[PDB]
Design a protein around this nucleic acid. Structure first.
Ligand SMILES: [Zn+2]
Ligand SMILES: [Zn+2]
Ligand SMILES: [Zn+2]
Lengths: 71, 396, 808, 103, 131
RNA sequence: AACAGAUACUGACACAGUCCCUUU
RNA sequence: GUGUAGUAUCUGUU
């Protein structure tokens, strides 16, 4: 059964899925990817004069409640 | 039309710079981690020059790096967490001049994912267990042990999952031959995703949680969970057991706090501010990295600020109860992403952007001209000045 | 409903399945009340055989799965009907009752079933008590035991009667038995619940508490010694103050507890119990004897004990009191004594036991000979033969041949023992080989055709050791003798002879085989027509070996005859024969050109037998792999034009199998088959599209990493419109093809394809698009990070990732 | 086995135990039943490798003879990083075949 | 309307901020020199013969087969992180041959139908020509 | 549309298997 | 030859 395998993973949707939560998942995954790779974090820390620790803290803070409150 | 990729110069940007005894001798080496290059360095203990011995390439994104040694052992190991869904233990060979893979275990898919561990790599101070965690919901514990043939072994992973949680930092707690314990800076988001008004996003605070590994029952259970005041960014391990007390130092914006489970009133000390600072008063102030120099006589911490000031934290305690935290200004160096203090009196500064420097500690900076600051004293200021407790000997 | 139940009860499989589907789907809407009211008496009808009962429990399982909440007022009756099924001599019946009760528990409130089972706890009948205890055990295995811990704690201390405490401890024991090592986090609670009964005063509760603590210790084999700390003193007192059943239970419990401890505790407690064990070795009852055998083997298999200590105390009384012939009657004592002796040999050494037992190895009794044979065989299998000296190996050889030469009936034990011994000895059996050869030849000579097959198995076993001992002449003589023995009538003996011949041919090469293959293969050819599995297997393996390695000595006409024979043989009812046949086709097509064999295979695609055609397609793919693909590909593509449907399906399946077989060197043939795949993927028939999707999946997985995305994009464009199907097989094929194309091309193109209908107004399209999106998302989401489309934000919600727009 | 929709995988977190295959299932892939290019060893969770179940066949439950493996296609698709592939169900064909034979 | 065709893909693993084609060593051939945000400097060079291309491809395949990445990653999957790799041969993995153990060296070279010194010379010639 | 009958097809689907806790 | 899951196309009665 394929549907049990996909149900457990976090991020998968279904027919009754709204757009806000889909983009919330997109944003959370994007923040985690930014934290993961190194040279992308270097890019972000050079584009604005902030230490990498500050950028990491800001990204972690934005993980809670992105894209505004729900409807 | 086929092309052939070649390299003339490898990356020279340090990301993790753990240290230890890897050659099995009395000399200490530094294992630095570039983006995808694993390199091992040996500073000269007589002329101060830094030399390179191995520059292997791993073809992957290294996300975490820590070292440990088994109790009664002499040679340290290397633990690597990366984008591959595996944990790998390495071991240096001075004779062959190479890294040998001792163990590897698979626990999930590949790539820098949200719910696949590999971000945090806390290890037990004695060497009895290791922990790998994800940013969300995934934590696995492995138990290390030795056999009759003097070889390390690994057990099956133990799961400590938790739904709808985020992890800021994970560190191992020095418990002194008791059940190994791990402390994490968790934070929940279940309710905030269910409040249209949006006040539930506010009033949500971090909780410091302790995970105790039950060796007798072979399972992990969380015991303590206390809400915090500010939002911490990273934790520090306090040497406990026979020397010093247990617990963890929590670093937040404009504060540093000591906490411990069971029965302890926490102690908070504000971070000193630079005198005649030109910055906007709106912004806060945080620490970026730290270090530890535990020794038989005493132990002290080091900490780096955003501006680039090195403090010297000393804990003052009763027979077993801690009383206050004493901060003192040590020196100022370029901002770094990792610092390490070795024996023989050397400081290695791995700058996060630019050249790297090696300093020799000539004075420990005690009872000098500058005053000290304490949590018992009822916004401190200090005057930065050129180097007094450091001498530069090498530049990379 | 009654007609559907009756049709399921007996009838033809097609109408039975149809009635089953109807009484599931429509009778869910009809209602559960009357359904159970009419079904339950059928199962509770006495003198009913097992077929109808199995069918009725199947239909109840289906309706219970489809109807969960509505069965709440019927749980009592369901338990009454199903609960006796828990106690049965059939593993399948026990299992099926287990998931029936588990599904009912998961489809009903726990409090409801607890209250239902309360009135049946206070009973003394051997049936009701045991069945209720096991029902509680499986119910607690489901739903988690913490939900039932307070109830067990309350009921274990019930003062209404002792039997309530007995039932509570029995429930704990059954939970330990069934749930296994999934109880380690909750060990201490159960230990605390049962220790009170352990320290009680009545014999029954004491015995059941000892049994439950033994079950818990067995569940936690490597862990939990700290949790077992309030029961040590009661056990070490009870062993001294008890006689009979209680003593046996306490001994079992302490034996299970011993391995958990550390070294010092192990040795102290093992001697403290060794005193009573040595006292009890001469117990008249057999159950006590097997229990103390288990206890002594557990104590011996512990780090704490010492080899010399065991040798000085345990060995003499054990050998004096247990190595006799009266215990040979029962199988349990047989197993326990054999395994305990093997473990003791592992502890002290192989020689210390072999030297003791080889003397009576050749005892006049037969069961004693079987016992010593099994013991020596296991000891040789584990330890080996390094500990055996010259006299010991001489005595062992004389004993084993003497025992084997007197074979009263069929017995695999002696043959396995002889084979193990001769393999373990290795080169050292060189002086004894001629006697073995003479004995095996004599046993192969005549005598009722019952020992010849055993001799054939023996020579097939010992061919390798005679090879290592440089005795090719004797095995060559045996091979030629078997060659004249190839014509006997009995099938089993013929299969054994063929196996021996195959073993010899493998052992000694075909360049110097004493019976030339030029005389062997024509002799083997008519044997293939024997419609018996045992003969056919060995014959086809021997033929395949000769074809693979000895193809130089056979003429092409003989190969064509045996090819026709293989074409006939592809009709076997067992898969191993068919796999051997297709391998032989491959070897023959390597030996000769791939033209004559291809025509015979391509003409076999109209036999109207589904598995025959599948095997022929696999054989065609094997030929296409062993030879170069472009030799046979034009013939297959030309053959595709036949108007018959089965021929086209066979061609497509052969293409899929070939593309699976060849991974890298398959990019040179994508162009040749692209028009044929485009023709196949057209909306006229389902099976063509299914098989073409399978071909696409295998090809895309094969060519991954070699930059052939241009034609794969076209194939994706042709295969995409098939996802809106309903038949499960076509759905599976299409999803597999899509996953393979996602791996070969990249997640960006698949995301672009699935990004249009992901919010379609129709409900029956969004689910399909979401299944496809989930399949794409689970694999390589970090690429989806960089492949996401830009979204314009709403009035209150920010939907733009501004971090990626930074520019240096 | 992919030929029976009714069968169910355990797919819990895998441990250090190694899976085994009987004589009938030898040489197959525990996911797709393919004989081509075994690639990676199969591991099972400690609940599957306990007591009587130790050293039994992954697919059908018979006595273990040889190790289990993942085919190259499954390794490429990363289907090996999913948990223990041990089958926990008994199937509908097996029980009905047994009952028909014991008619 | 009209679309462009992708003819090459790769994954350096480090963000690139400069691409520029020129000649480095006098008397050599021009190459596509690039520099990355982490401090690395690399080049991409073409093959002078088809035999060289097949040889290097087969060497890369064998080294990927028997010399896996140290940290447990898959080299081909790493190089196809976002888009599948196309018409690029990784030279770092190929040059990892020169520091391998002698037994594996002779095994791989015999699979190459060459002796290890010949493989070393062949690997060094392209680097000493282009750079 | 529902009830019923008939004919074709797919799944390298399978073939005395065997039970490997069945507790006192 | 039989049994375990499915599928397609025809014919009769409402
Ligand atoms: Zn499992
Ligand atoms: Zn099997
Ligand atoms: Zn597979």
């Amino acid at each position: 059964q394929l549907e049990h395998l996909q149900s457990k993973y976090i991020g998968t949707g279904h027919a009754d899925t709204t757009k806000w939560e889909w983009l919330v998942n997109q944003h959370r995954d994007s923040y985690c990817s930014y934290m993961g790779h190194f040279d992308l974090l270097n890019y972000f820390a050079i584009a604005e004069n902030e230490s990498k620790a500050r950028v990491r803290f800001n990204l972690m803070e934005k993980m809670l409640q992105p894209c505004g409150p729900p409807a | 039309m086929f092309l052939y990729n070649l390299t003339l110069q490898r990356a020279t940007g340090i990301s993790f710079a753990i240290h230890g005894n890897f050659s099995g001798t009395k000399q200490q080496e530094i294992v630095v981690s570039r983006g995808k290059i694993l390199e091992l360095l040996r500073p000269d203990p007589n002329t101060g020059k830094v030399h390179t011995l191995l520059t292997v390439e791993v073809f992957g994104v290294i996300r975490s790096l820590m070292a440990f040694r088994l109790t009664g052992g002499t040679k340290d190991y290397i633990v690597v967490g990366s984008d591959s869904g595996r944990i790998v233990i390495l071991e240096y060979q001075p004779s062959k001049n190479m890294f040998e893979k001792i163990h590897q275990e698979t626990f999930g898919k590949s790539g820098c994912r949200r719910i696949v561990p590999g971000q945090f790599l806390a290890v037990d101070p004695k060497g009895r267990a290791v922990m790998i965690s994800a940013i969300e919901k995934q934590k696995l514990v492995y138990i290390l042990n030795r056999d009759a043939a003097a070889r390390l072994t690994i057990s099956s992973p133990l799961e400590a999952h938790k739904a709808n949680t985020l992890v800021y930092h994970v560190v191992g707690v020095d418990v002194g031959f008791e059940n190994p314990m791990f402390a994490c800076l968790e934070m929940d988001y279940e309710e905030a995703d269910n409040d249209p008004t949006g006040e539930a996003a506010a009033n949500t605070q971090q909780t410091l949680t302790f995970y105790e590994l039950d060796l007798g029952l072979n399972h992990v259970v969380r015991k303590y969970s206390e809400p915090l005041e500010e939002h911490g960014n990273f934790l520090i391990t306090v040497p406990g057991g026979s020397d010093g007390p247990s617990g963890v130092l929590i670093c937040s914006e404009n504060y540093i706090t000591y906490k411990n489970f069971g029965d302890q009133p926490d102690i908070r000390c504000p971070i000193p501010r630079r005198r005649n600072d030109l910055d906007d008063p709106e912004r806060g102030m945080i620490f970026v990295c730290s270090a530890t120099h535990k020794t038989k006589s005493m132990f002290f911490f080091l900490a780096q600020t955003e501006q680039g000031d090195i403090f010297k934290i000393t804990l003052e305690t009763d027979e077993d109860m801690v009383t206050e935290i004493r901060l003192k200004y040590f020196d100022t160096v370029p901002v770094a992403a990792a610092m390490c203090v070795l024996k023989t009196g050397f400081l290695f500064v791995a700058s996060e952007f630019g050249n790297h420097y090696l300093y020799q500690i000539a004075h420990l900076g005690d009872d000098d001209e500058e005053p000290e600051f304490s949590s018992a004293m009822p916004t401190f200021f200090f005057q930065p000045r050129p180097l007094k407790n450091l001498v530069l000997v090498d530049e990379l | 409903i009654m007609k559907l139940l009756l049709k399921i009860k007996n009838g033809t499989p097609p109408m039975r399945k149809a009635a089953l589907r109807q009484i599931t789907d429509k009778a869910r809407e009809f209602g559960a009340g009357p359904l159970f009211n009419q079904i339950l008496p059928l199962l509770m009808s006495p003198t009913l055989e097992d077929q109808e009962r199995h069918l009725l429990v199947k239909v109840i399982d289906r309706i219970l799965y489809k109807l969960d909440d509505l069965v709440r007022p019927y749980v009592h009756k369901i338990l009454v009907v199903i609960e006796p099924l828990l106690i049965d001599e059939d593993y399948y019946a026990r299992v099926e009752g287990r998931e029936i009760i588990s599904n009912l528990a998961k489809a009903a409130g726990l409090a409801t079933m607890i209250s239902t089972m309360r009135p049946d706890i206070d009973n003394m009948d051997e049936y009701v008590h045991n069945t209720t205890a096991r029902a509680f055990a499986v119910v607690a295995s489901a739903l988690g035991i913490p939900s039932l811990l307070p109830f067990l704690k309350a009921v274990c201390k019930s003062k209404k009667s002792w039997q309530a405490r007995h039932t509570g401890i029995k429930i704990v024991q059954q939970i330990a038995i069934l749930m296994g090592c999934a109880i380690l986090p909750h060990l201490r609670s159960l230990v605390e619940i049962i220790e009170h009964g352990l320290v009680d005063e009545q014999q029954k509760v004491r015995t059941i508490s000892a049994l439950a603590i033994a079950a818990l210790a067995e569940a936690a084999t490597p862990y939990g010694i700290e949790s077992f700390d309030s029961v040590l003193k009661p056990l070490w007192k009870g062993i001294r103050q008890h006689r009979g059943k209680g003593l046996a239970a306490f001994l079992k419990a302490i034996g299970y507890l011993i391995p958990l401890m550390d070294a010092e505790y192990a040795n102290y407690y093992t001697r403290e119990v060794m005193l009573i064990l040595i006292r009890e070795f001469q117990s008249p009852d057999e159950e006590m004897k097997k229990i103390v055998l288990k206890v002594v083997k557990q104590c011996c298999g512990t780090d704490g004990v010492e080899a010399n200590y065991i040798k000085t105390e345990i060995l003499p009384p054990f050998f004096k009191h247990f190595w006799q012939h009266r215990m040979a009657l029962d199988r349990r004592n047989y197993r326990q004594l054999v395994d305990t002796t093997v473990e003791l040999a592992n502890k002290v050494g192989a020689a210390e036991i072999i030297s003791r037992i080889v003397d009576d190895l050749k005892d006049e009794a037969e069961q004693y000979r079987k016992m010593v044979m099994e013991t020596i065989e296991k000891i040789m299998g584990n330890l080996g033969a390094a500990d055996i000296d010259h006299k010991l190996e001489e005595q062992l050889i004389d004993g084993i041949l003497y025992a084997f030469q007197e074979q009263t009936t069929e017995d695999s034990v002696m043959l396995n023992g002889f084979g193990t011994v001769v393999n373990a000895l290795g080169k050292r059996v060189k002086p004894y080989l001629p006697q073995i050869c003479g004995t095996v030849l004599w046993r192969l000579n005549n005598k009722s055709a019952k020992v010849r097959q055993q001799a054939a198995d023996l020579i097939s076993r010992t061919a390798v050791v005679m090879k290592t001992c440089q005795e090719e002449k004797l095995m060559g003589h045996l091979g030629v003798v078997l060659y004249e023995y190839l014509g006997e009538e009995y099938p089993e003996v013929l299969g054994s002879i063929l196996g021996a011949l195959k073993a010899i041919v493998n052992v000694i090469g075909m360049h110097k085989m004493t019976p030339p293959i030029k005389d062997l293969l024509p002799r083997l050819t008519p044997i293939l027509k024997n419609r018996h599995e045992k003969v056919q297997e060995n014959c086809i393996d021997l033929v395949g070996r000769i074809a693979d390695r000895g193809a130089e000595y056979v003429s092409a006409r003989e190969w064509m005859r045996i090819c026709f024979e293989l074409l006939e043989l592809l009709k076997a009812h067992k898969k191993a024969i068919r796999r051997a046949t297709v391998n032989t086709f491959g070897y023959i097509a390597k030996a000769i050109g791939p033209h004559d064999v291809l025509a015979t295979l391509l003409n076999n695609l109209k036999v109207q037998e589904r598995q025959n055609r599948v095997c022929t397609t696999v054989a065609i793919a094997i030929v296409a792999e062993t030879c170069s693909p472009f030799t046979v590909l034009p013939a297959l593509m030309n053959e595709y034009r036949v108007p018959e449907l089965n021929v086209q399906n066979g061609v497509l399946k052969s293409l899929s199998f070939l593309f699976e077989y060849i991974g890298e060197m398959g990019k040179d043939y994508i162009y040749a088959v692209t028009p044929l795949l485009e023709d196949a993927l057209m909306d006229r028939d389902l099976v063509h599209r299914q098989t073409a999707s399978a071909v696409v999946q295998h090809m895309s997985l094969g060519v991954y990493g070699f930059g052939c995305e241009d034609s794969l994009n076209h194939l994706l464009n042709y295969v995409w419109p098939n996802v809106f199907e309903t038949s499960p097989h076509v759905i599976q094929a299409v999803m597999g093809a899509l996953e393979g194309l996602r791996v070969a091309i990249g997640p960006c193109r698949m995301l672009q394809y699935c990004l249009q209908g992901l919010f379609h107004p129709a409900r029956k399209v969004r689910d399909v698009y979401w299944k496809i999106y989930n399949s794409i998302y689970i694999g390589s989401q970090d690429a989806l990070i960089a492949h996401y489309p830009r979204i314009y934000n709403d009035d209150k919600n920010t939907y733009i990732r501004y971090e990626l727009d930074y520019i240096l | 086995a992919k030929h029976h929709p009714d069968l169910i995988f355990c797919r819990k977190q895998a441990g250090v135990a190694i899976g085994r295959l009987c004589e009938k299932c030898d040489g197959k892939c525990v996911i797709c039943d393919s004989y081509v290019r075994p690639c990676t060893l199969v591991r099972i969770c400690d609940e599957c490798n306990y007591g009587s179940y130790q050293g039994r066949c992954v697919i059908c439950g018979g006595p273990g003879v040889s190790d289990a493996y993942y085919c190259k296609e499954c390794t490429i698709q990363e289907k090996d990083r999913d948990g223990c592939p041990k089958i926990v169900n008994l199937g509908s064909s097996k029980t009905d075949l047994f009952y028909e034979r014991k008619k | 309307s009209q679309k462009a065709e992708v003819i090459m893909n790769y994954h350096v693993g480090e963000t690139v901020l400069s691409l520029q084609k020129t000649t480095l060593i006098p008397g050599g051939s021009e190459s596509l020199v690039y520099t990355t945000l982490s401090g690395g400097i690399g080049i991409l060079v073409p093959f002078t013969s088809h035999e060289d291309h097949d040889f290097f491809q087969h060497v890369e395949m064998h080294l990927r087969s028997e010399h896996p990445p140290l940290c447990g990653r898959d080299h081909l999957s790493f190089r196809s992180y976002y888009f599948p790799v196309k018409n690029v041969i990784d030279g770092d993995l190929c040059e990892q041959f020169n520091s391998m153990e002698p037994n594996k060296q002779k095994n791989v070279s015999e699979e190459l139908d060459r002796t290890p010194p010949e493989v070393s010379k062949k690997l060094e010639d392209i680097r000493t020509r282009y750079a």
